[PDB]
Write an enzyme that holds these catalytic residues in place. Structure first.
Site, PDB file in Angstrom:
ATOM      1  N   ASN A  87       0.820  -1.208   0.000  1.00 32.43           N
ATOM      2  CA  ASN A  87       0.000   0.000   0.000  1.00 32.43           C
ATOM      3  C   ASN A  87       0.862   1.270   0.000  1.00 32.43           C
ATOM      4  O   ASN A  87       2.019   1.236   0.428  1.00 32.43           O
ATOM      5  CB  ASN A  87      -0.948  -0.008   1.210  1.00 32.43           C
ATOM      6  CG  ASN A  87      -1.928  -1.196   1.184  1.00 32.43           C
ATOM      7  OD1 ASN A  87      -2.488  -1.539   0.135  1.00 32.43           O
ATOM      8  ND2 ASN A  87      -2.136  -1.816   2.341  1.00 32.43           N
ATOM      9  N   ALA A  88       0.281   2.385  -0.456  1.00 30.95           N
ATOM     10  CA  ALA A  88       1.005   3.657  -0.582  1.00 30.95           C
ATOM     11  C   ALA A  88       1.524   4.198   0.741  1.00 30.95           C
ATOM     12  O   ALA A  88       2.519   4.933   0.761  1.00 30.95           O
ATOM     13  CB  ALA A  88       0.126   4.713  -1.310  1.00 30.95           C
ATOM     14  N   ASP A  89       0.880   3.817   1.852  1.00 28.70           N
ATOM     15  CA  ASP A  89       1.295   4.283   3.171  1.00 28.70           C
ATOM     16  C   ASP A  89       2.373   3.401   3.832  1.00 28.70           C
ATOM     17  O   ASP A  89       2.727   3.586   5.002  1.00 28.70           O
ATOM     18  CB  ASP A  89       0.085   4.480   4.108  1.00 28.70           C
ATOM     19  CG  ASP A  89      -0.706   3.179   4.359  1.00 28.70           C
ATOM     20  OD1 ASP A  89      -0.413   2.132   3.717  1.00 28.70           O
ATOM     21  OD2 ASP A  89      -1.639   3.233   5.196  1.00 28.70           O
ATOM     22  N   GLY A  90       2.935   2.482   3.063  1.00 32.05           N
ATOM     23  CA  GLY A  90       3.995   1.614   3.590  1.00 32.05           C
ATOM     24  C   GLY A  90       3.479   0.330   4.232  1.00 32.05           C
ATOM     25  O   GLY A  90       4.278  -0.516   4.685  1.00 32.05           O
ATOM     26  N   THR A  91       2.157   0.172   4.290  1.00 28.21           N
ATOM     27  CA  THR A  91       1.604  -1.057   4.841  1.00 28.21           C
ATOM     28  C   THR A  91       1.436  -2.101   3.739  1.00 28.21           C
ATOM     29  O   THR A  91       1.706  -1.824   2.555  1.00 28.21           O
ATOM     30  CB  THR A  91       0.327  -0.833   5.675  1.00 28.21           C
ATOM     31  OG1 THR A  91      -0.754  -0.411   4.839  1.00 28.21           O
ATOM     32  CG2 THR A  91       0.573   0.194   6.771  1.00 28.21           C
TER      33      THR A  91
END
Ligand SMILES: OC[C@H]1O[C@@H](O[C@H]2[C@H](O)[C@@H](O)[C@H](S[C@H]3[C@H](O)[C@@H](O)[C@H](O[C@H]4[C@H](O)[C@@H](O)[C@H](S[C@H]5[C@H](O)[C@@H](O)[C@H](O[C@H]6[C@H](O)[C@@H](O)[C@H](S[C@H]7[C@H](O)[C@@H](O)[C@H](O[C@H]8[C@H](O)[C@@H](O)[C@H](S[C@H]9[C@H](O)[C@@H](O)[C@H](O)O[C@@H]9CO)O[C@@H]8CO)O[C@@H]7CO)O[C@@H]6CO)O[C@@H]5CO)O[C@@H]4CO)O[C@@H]3CO)O[C@@H]2CO)[C@H](O)[C@@H](O)[C@@H]1S
Ligand SMILES: [Ca+2]
Length: 629
Positions: A452-456
């Site tokens: 995911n874009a948020d690093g998750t």
């Protein structure tokens, strides 16, 4: 001298090792035994967080082996073996050789059926049903000079939370216990925890015995233990690496190597059908090795009399791909420092290595995920295998070996734990069979990792299955199993599974040069480090979807049977899970959990499982060694 390691990932190992060993974090009991989890409100396979398992001990070994590799100090690894032998391998007092020496290799145990509902137990023993001969006992007593078995019992109540104590004293710690007894529908929520050493002091009139087994007469006072083969095989795997890493630095762990080798020799009991019936001809008693499937089955178990002298041993008819360990089998059959003392130890393991690799390939789906396994005992009563059921050496395919609540192959975790060992074998030997399995499996799973874009990130969590593999023909080999399919049901952020996945992909990438695998492994490791670190290791919030079962799961108790747990909790028909574990109401998280349920919410927890933290630490160390730049 040891080769250079990637300093970034070595530092991340070292940090994790410090958090795990930090007394302020509470991963270990006062006796130096690791708990399943720091948190106590914990039901998933064990039903209390501060038990220990042979699984946790084997991860403690692997963790300390890796610490040895980076620090040059192997005293922690030797201590992990000392603690294991002291506390998890039943001593002379726990499995009296006076009873074990009365074992009869020509009649290892008495048959009883397994049932598909806990309400059918106690199961009646039947002396008239055939039982085969045990061909390895004489090899073991001759080599080791005892009738005691050297294998880990799978679970220990470390701080005596249940109150059984040691050898029925009520007060000592740690306490040997067992839970599962009543077949495939008995989930962790439906057991009645019981002492391994039953002198009838707790429970009912005859302790807990007649909940599970029904005999002709009066139940005898008796002990019993059960192995978890995947844990003992991981102990061998870890100790091999400790030995390699120690010798690169001019150090020695020879003592520990001897213990691992001996454990691997006893671990052969998991190679045999439960009652030593012939493999693929289950109506017939075996004559020795015709009862060996040569796979790591779900357990072996043994026990015997406390106040009279007799004993028994069983293997297991049920095999899951998740338990296999071709790496351990390679070690024990080929490495001269790990050759078992018994006459046939190394050659049996050689046969197992070949058999296990066949088993994985038979079970490999069209997409590449590995299906469940096979049994030599249909319905656990040696029933006829339905026509149209696919078979492997006469054993019928089973989608979910051993457990159906939940299905034992509906969790993604088994894929990574097991394929990780195939990846070590492939890395070490370049074995073609291992390559073929991994090429297809890795291609499958690299398509299922989502960043995911948020690093998750997310990876598969719950999976499901359609169809069956084609009947195995060793001379035809793999058909592609066009009619066997995996389905990903949901995704999650399981940090232990992601760690094991990163480990598998790293060994595979190192050998194959697959860039996609290498970068996925590094991205997982980085995401976990950057986004999920906490003061105790790593964690995330997870939903505990089955926790409603604390309050609503009825536990089956036979009509008319009444007894008490050591704390006075009454066991009788009608009780729920919590009624026979009333101490759980004093847990710091209990009120939080109940409030959630009362509001119709799913409870959440943030959990530090010892195996998952160790998995993450080891996965960093592996990447550091294999990718120094
Ligand atoms: O003549 C004198 C005398 O005779 C007397 O008669 C005698 C007679 O002579 C004699 O022959 C008979 S013998 C008889 C005996 O009496 C009787 O007791 C015996 O019964 C046996 C039964 O036949 C047999 O069926 C059972 S087998 C059963 C075992 O008992 C039990 O121990 C074992 O339990 C397993 C367990 O199932 C397993 O899980 C674990 S190991 C490990 C797993 O490997 C691993 O997968 C798992 O990892 C967990 C992880 O820890 C978690 O964190 C994660 S959580 C995860 C979620 O799952 C996800 O959904 C979520 O999304 O994400 C989460 C986070 O990641 O989950 C993973 C996966 O689950 O963990 C566990 C470790 O934690 O191993 C154990 C051990 O193997 O189960 C077995 C199968 O059910 O055994 C019985 C014995 O116990 O039979 C014999 C022969 O018939 O006795 C006569 C009578 O005494 C006369 O009576 C006298 O009068 C006279 S004097
Ligand atoms: Ca059930």
């Amino acid at each position: 001298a040891s080769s250079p390691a990637n300093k970034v990932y070595q530092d991340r190992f070292e940090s994790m090792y410090s958090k795990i060993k930090d007394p302020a974090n509470g991963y270990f009991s006062e006796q130096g035994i690791p708990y399943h989890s720091i948190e106590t409100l914990m039901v998933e396979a064990p039903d209390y967080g501060h038990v220990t398992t042979s699984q946790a001990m084997s991860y403690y070994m692997w963790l300390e082996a890796m610490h040895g590799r980076f620090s040059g100090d192997f005293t922690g690894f030797d201590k992990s073996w000392s603690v294991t032998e002291q506390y998890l391998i039943p001593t002379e007092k726990d499995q009296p050789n006076t009873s074990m020496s009365r074992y009869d290799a020509n009649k290892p145990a008495t048959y009883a059926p397994e049932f598909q509902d806990p309400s059918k137990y106690p199961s009646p023993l039947d002396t008239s049903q055939p039982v085969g001969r045990d061909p390895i006992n004489s090899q073991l007593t001759s080599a080791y000079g005892t009738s005691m078995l050297y294998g880990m019992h799978w679970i220990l109540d470390v701080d005596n939370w249940y109150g059984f104590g040691a050898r029925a004293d009520g007060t000592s710690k740690p306490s040997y216990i067992n839970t599962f007894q009543r077949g495939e529908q008995e989930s962790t929520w439906e057991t009645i925890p019981q002492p391994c050493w039953d002198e009838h002091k707790f429970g009912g009139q005859y302790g807990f015995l007649d909940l599970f087994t029904k005999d002709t007469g009066t139940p005898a006072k008796q002990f019993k233990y059960t192995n978890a083969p995947d844990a003992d095989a991981r102990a061998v795997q870890a100790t091999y690496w400790a030995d390699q890493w120690a010798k690169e630095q001019g150090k020695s762990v020879s003592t520990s190597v001897g213990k691992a080798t001996k454990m691997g020799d006893y671990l052969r009991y998991s190679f045999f059908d439960k009652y030593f019936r012939k493999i693929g001809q289950p109506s017939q008693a075996g004559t020795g090795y015709d009862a060996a499937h040569y796979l790591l089955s779900w357990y072996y178990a043994w026990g015997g009399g406390i106040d009279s002298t007799w004993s028994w041993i069983i293997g297991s008819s049920h095999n899951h791909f998740g338990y296999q360990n071709p790496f351990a089998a390679w070690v024990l059959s080929t490495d001269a420092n790990f050759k078992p003392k018994s006459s046939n130890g190394a050659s049996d393991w050689a046969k197992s290595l070949d058999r296990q690799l066949e088993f994985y390939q038979w079970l490999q789906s069209a997409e590449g995920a590995i299906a469940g396994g096979a049994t030599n005992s249909w319905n656990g009563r040696y029933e006829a295998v339905p026509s149209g059921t696919s078979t492997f050496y006469g054993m019928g395919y089973v989608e979910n070996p051993v457990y159906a609540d939940p299905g034992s192959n509906t969790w993604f975790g088994m894929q990574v734990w097991s394929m990780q060992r195939v990846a070590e074998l492939y890395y070490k030997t370049g074995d073609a069979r291992a390559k073929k399995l991994l090429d297809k499996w890795a291609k499958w799973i690299n398509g299922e990792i989502k960043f995911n874009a948020d690093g998750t990130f997310q990876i598969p969590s719950t999976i499901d299955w359609e169809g069956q593999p084609d009947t195995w023909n060793p001379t035809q080999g793999y058909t592609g199993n066009a009619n066997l399919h995996v389905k990903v049901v949901n995704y999650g952020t399981d940090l232990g599974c992601a760690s094991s996945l990163a480990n598998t992909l790293t060994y595979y990438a190192a050998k194959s040069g697959d860039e996609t695998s290498r970068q996925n492994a590094q991205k997982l490791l980085d995401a976990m480090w950057n986004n999920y670190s906490d003061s105790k290791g790593i964690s995330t919030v997870e939903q505990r979807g089955d926790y409603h079962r604390f309050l609503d799961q009825e536990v089956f108790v036979p009509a008319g049977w009444t007894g008490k747990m050591p704390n006075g909790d009454v066991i009788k028909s009608g009780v729920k899970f919590i009624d026979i574990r009333s101490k759980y109401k004093q847990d710091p998280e209990w009120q939080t959990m109940v409030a959630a349920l009362q509001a119709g919410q799913v409870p959440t927890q943030r959990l530090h499982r010892f195996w998952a933290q160790s998995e993450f630490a080891v996965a960093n160390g592996v990447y550091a060694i294999l990718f120094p730049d």
